[PDB]
């Protein structure tokens, strides 16, 4: 009776194998964008992904993982909220089984259909495992995905997805350039939270991006074909595996726009 995203075992159940799930910096949040701050001492976000090296993609059993070389300062975040530098080691995303949700965080109460994180870990903690047990670990950029024209450069994902259909199914996947999934500007708000996916922990700075990327409705369709389930298992589709807003309690959200 593991995690995971249904009735039995879903977001409203996780508080038990991990009571973090009620703590003071959970993530996501709805971003009310009239009570946001600007604030003019944000830097610009600084995206160095010209180097990144993609190395394989893995169906975990809850959403499919991207996963980078993340053994040097290849690619890498920094500026925005962030002091020092992030490195990336992974992405993913999370969708829902309709156009109207998917989103974890959500402007405004806007669900969107989909979202993106690219997870990135603090350098001065020397590995990922050391950077999740420290408040500053993580920096995770979010960016919403909207149903409309496609995305080419997505289209490497939603291609190789039939060969990772079920839990634990892994495929290379190297070359992948994930500048091909930015919108034009880097425009966010930023508040501290925490991971949104069991072990909950509080450990990232988000960096949410203000303008969505547009996706086909072909290439959402094919992430609700991928399988929650192991081969060999009845099939239970891989869709609604987004937590939904947390409390924002002592928080406040920035703008850097
Ligand atoms: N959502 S998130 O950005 O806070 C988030 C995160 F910051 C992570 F660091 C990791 C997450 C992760 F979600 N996952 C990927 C996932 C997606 C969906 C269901 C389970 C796991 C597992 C691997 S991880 O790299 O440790
Ligand atoms: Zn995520």
Same mark, same amino acid.
């Given at each position: #009776? #593991?995690?995971?995203?249904?009735? #039995? !075992?879903?977001?409203?159940?996780?508080?038990?194998?991990?009571? *973090?799930?009620?703590?003071?910096?959970?993530?996501?949040?709805?971003?009310?964008?009239?009570?946001?701050?600007?604030?003019?001492?944000?830097?610009?976000?600084?995206?160095?992904?010209?180097?990144? %090296?993609?190395?394989?993609?893995?169906?975990?059993?809850?959403?499919? !993982?991207?996963?980078?070389?993340?053994?040097?300062?290849?690619?890498?975040?920094?500026?925005?909220?962030?002091?020092? %530098?992030?490195?990336?080691?992974?992405? #993913?995303?999370?969708?829902?089984?309709?156009?109207?949700?998917?989103?974890?965080?959500?402007?405004?109460?806007?669900?969107?259909?989909?979202?993106?994180?690219?997870?990135?870990?603090?350098?001065?903690?020397?590995?990922?495992?050391?950077?999740?047990?420290?408040?500053?670990?993580?920096?995770?950029?979010?960016?919403?995905?909207?149903?409309?024209?496609?995305?080419?450069?997505?289209?490497?994902?939603?291609?190789?997805?039939?060969?990772?259909?079920?839990?634990?199914?892994?495929?290379?996947?190297?070359?992948?350039?994930?500048?091909?999934?930015?919108?034009?500007?880097?425009?966010?708000?930023?508040?501290?939270?925490?991971?949104? %996916?069991?072990?909950?922990?509080?450990?990232?700075?988000?960096?949410?991006?203000?303008?969505? *990327?547009?996706?086909?409705?072909?290439?959402?369709?094919?992430?609700?074909?991928?399988?929650?389930?192991?081969?060999?298992?009845?099939?239970?589709?891989?869709?609604? !595996?987004?937590?939904?807003?947390?409390?924002?309690? !002592?928080?406040? *959200?920035?703008?850097?726009?």
């Amino acid at each position: #009776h #593991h995690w995971g995203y249904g009735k #039995h !075992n879903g977001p409203e159940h996780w508080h038990k194998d991990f009571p *973090i799930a009620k703590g003071e910096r959970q993530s996501p949040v709805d971003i009310d964008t009239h009570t946001a701050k600007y604030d003019p001492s944000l830097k610009p976000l600084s995206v160095s992904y010209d180097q990144a %090296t993609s190395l394989r993609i893995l169906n975990n059993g809850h959403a499919f !993982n991207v996963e980078f070389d993340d053994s040097q300062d290849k690619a890498v975040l920094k500026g925005g909220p962030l002091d020092g %530098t992030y490195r990336l080691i992974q992405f #993913h995303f999370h969708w829902g089984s309709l156009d109207g949700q998917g989103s974890e965080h959500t402007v405004d109460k806007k669900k969107y259909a989909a979202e993106l994180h690219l997870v990135h870990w603090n350098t001065k903690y020397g590995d990922f495992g050391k950077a999740v047990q420290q408040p500053d670990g993580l920096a995770v950029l979010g960016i919403f995905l909207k149903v409309g024209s496609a995305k080419p450069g997505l289209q490497k994902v939603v291609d190789v997805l039939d060969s990772i259909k079920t839990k634990g199914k892994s495929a290379d996947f190297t070359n992948f350039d994930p500048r091909g999934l930015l919108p034009e500007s880097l425009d966010y708000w930023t508040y501290p939270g925490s991971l949104t %996916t069991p072990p909950l922990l509080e450990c990232v700075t988000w960096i949410v991006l203000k303008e969505p *990327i547009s996706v086909s409705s072909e290439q959402v369709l094919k992430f609700r074909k991928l399988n929650f389930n192991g081969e060999g298992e009845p099939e239970e589709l891989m869709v609604d !595996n987004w937590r939904p807003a947390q409390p924002l309690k !002592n928080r406040q *959200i920035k703008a850097s726009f």
